[PDB]
Every structure is written in structure tokens, then in C-alpha cells.
């Protein structure tokens, strides 16, 4: 079956969810995407590594390009294994240095590709630097096809960020055209009913077994667990 990644920026909420997942479905938990203050993220990373095994992957979100390397070094020292660079479309020339320092640490590089004047240049740079690219499905279709074709040719894993059910249909169709496609980042799930609709669409597309990420932004602890279990059944 598929494995679950969880994205949550609140430490108290993430740990409460993580403790429950460890008790119920520890072997299905693949990793966590964490963010926030360096002091909070580093404490979360240690807590998550204490809960789960040394095999737990932890992605630290970097939202400030000029502070990314310092936050990355401290997070990796806590046990993080990957970075997710957001806001790269503003200053594309800054990603090489960040990606170079990530590589020197043996850290995976994930680049979030969102809209902007330099979105194609960001996509090109991400293709030359990143292990994986997260493509916002809300992007215009021709732009998304461009980014996916660029990443595929570079051998970069492609992750589709989806929020609407129509975004799911878009990403599913494009996923079948993208060999580099690796999985979905599920945003907007607010109850088990929405989690069921996604699970059914993924089943109809034959994409169930791929690991996915569930963003917990729109969920409380009990609904996050119920939505996670609903997607994983």
C-alpha cells in the first residue's frame, strides 16, 4: 500500500498527529515536511526521530532565501534529510548556492515551482539542481506541461500539488503523460468526505500505491488522523 507524508507547520499539532500515527500505523509513515522557526523546527525534528526510526525522512521548508543555508545546516544537524525551497521564482540565481550547500551535506533538494515572471527560468534552474520539483497544478496548463517536460528531460522527480478536485483531474491526466511523476501533494482536504473523493479518483486512475503527502493545514488532529486512515485503507 501507499505510504503517507504529513505536512504541518504547527509543532504542537504535528506532534499530536505523529504520536497517534506511530501508535496506529507506524509502518505506513514515510516522512514529514516541517516548517517555522529554526528553534521550533529543530526540536520537532528530534521529537520525530525519537518517535519513528532513523529511516524517517524529514523535509524542512525554507521560505527565506537569504536565511535558508543557516536554517538548513541546523535542521540537518537535528536529523533532517531534505529541504523544500519555496519562493524560488523571485531570486532564481540564489538556488545554486543553496542547492550546492545542500548537496555538500548529502541533503535532498526539492524546489517548489509557483507562478511568477521567471517561472520557466526557475523551472530550468530547478531541473539542473533539484532531486524533485513540486508543480502547482493551479498554474496555466501550457506552463505546467513546460515545467514537467523540462524536469522529465533532466531526470527530476515531479510532484503535483493539488487542491481542487478539478486540479486532481488535471494532475491525473498529466501524470499519465509524465514518466518522472512520483506523487501528489494533497492540499485542501478538510474532512473525511473530501479524503474519500480523492481516494476514489486515485483508485480509478490506478495511482493508489504511490506515496502521497497530506497537508494538515485545513484539519484538526482527529480529522487529520481520520483523513489519513481513509486515504490509506
For residues 3 and 54, the answer to whether their CB atoms sit within 8 Å is no
Q: What is the resolution of this structure in A?
A: 1.7
Q: Domains in the chain, please, with CATH?
A: 4-232 (3.20.20.60)
How far from the centroid of its chain's Cα atoms is residue 122's Cα? 18
Question: How many whole angstroms separate alpha carbon 136 and alpha carbon 122?
Answer: 13
Alpha carbons within 13 angstroms on the beta-carbon side of residue 143 total 17
How far from the centroid of its chain's Cα atoms is residue 195's Cα? 17
The greatest distance separating any two alpha carbons of the chain, rounded to the nearest whole angstrom, comes to: 46
Altogether, the residues listed in the chain come to a count of 233
**Secondary structure of residue 147 in the 3-state scheme:** helix
Question: How many whole angstroms separate alpha carbon 86 and alpha carbon 142?
Answer: 21
What are 147-152's contacts with CB under 8 Å, separation 24+? 147/113, 147/119, 147/120, 147/123, 148/174, 148/177, 148/178, 148/180, 148/181, 150/120, 150/123, 150/124, 151/123, 151/126, 151/127, 151/180, 152/178, 152/179, 152/180
For residues 158 and 148, the answer to whether their CB atoms sit within 8 Å is yes
Cα dihedral sign, 223-168-59-179 = positive
Question: How many whole angstroms separate alpha carbon 109 and alpha carbon 92?
Answer: 14
Amino acid at each position: 500500500g501507499p505510504g503517507i507524508w504529513l505536512r504541518e507547520v504547527d509543532r504542537d499539532k504535528l506532534i499530536a498527529v505523529a504520536k497517534k500515527l506511530k501508535e496506529i500505523i507506524p509502518d505506513r509513515v514515510k516522512g514529514f515536511v516541517v516548517g517555522g522557526k529554526t528553534d521550533d523546527v529543530v526540536a520537532t525534528i528530534r521529537d520525530l526521530i525519537a518517535l519513528f526510526g532513523p529511516d524517517l525522512e524529514i523535509v524542512v521548508e525554507l521560505t527565506e532565501l537569504d536565511k535558508a543555508i543557516e536554517t538548513m545546516k541546523k535542521a540537518v544537524e537535528a536529523g533532517a534529510s531534505a529541504i523544500l525551497l519555496r519562493d524560488g521564482v523571485r531570486g532564481v540565481e540564489e538556488l545554486r548556492k543553496i542547492a550546492e550547500e545542500a548537496k555538500k551535506l548529502g541533503v535532498k533538494v526539492i524546489v517548489d515551482v509557483t507562478d511568477g515572471p521567471d517561472v520557466l527560468e526557475l523551472a530550468r534552474e530547478a531541473a539542473a539542481l533539484a532531486d524533485a520539483i513540486v508543480i502547482d497544478t493551479g498554474l496555466p496548463l501550457d506552463t505546467r506541461e513546460a515545467i514537467a517536460a523540462l524536469a522529465d528531460a533532466a531526470g527530476v522527480d515531479v510532484i503535483f500539488r493539488v487542491s481542487g478536485l478539478d486540479q486532481v483531474d488535471d494532475a491525473v491526466a498529466l501524470a499519465a503523460r509524465t514518466p518522472a511523476f512520483k506523487g501528489f501533494l494533497l492540499e485542501g482536504v478538510r474532512d473525511v468526505a473530501a479524503a474519500e473523493a480523492v481516494r476514489a479518483r486515485l483508485a480509478a486512475a490506478g495511482l493508489t500505491d504511490l506515496d502521497f503527502l497530506l497537508a494538515l493545514d485545513g484539519l484538526d488532529v482527529d480529522t487529520a488522523i481520520a483523513a489519513a486512515l481513509a486515504l490509506l485503507e
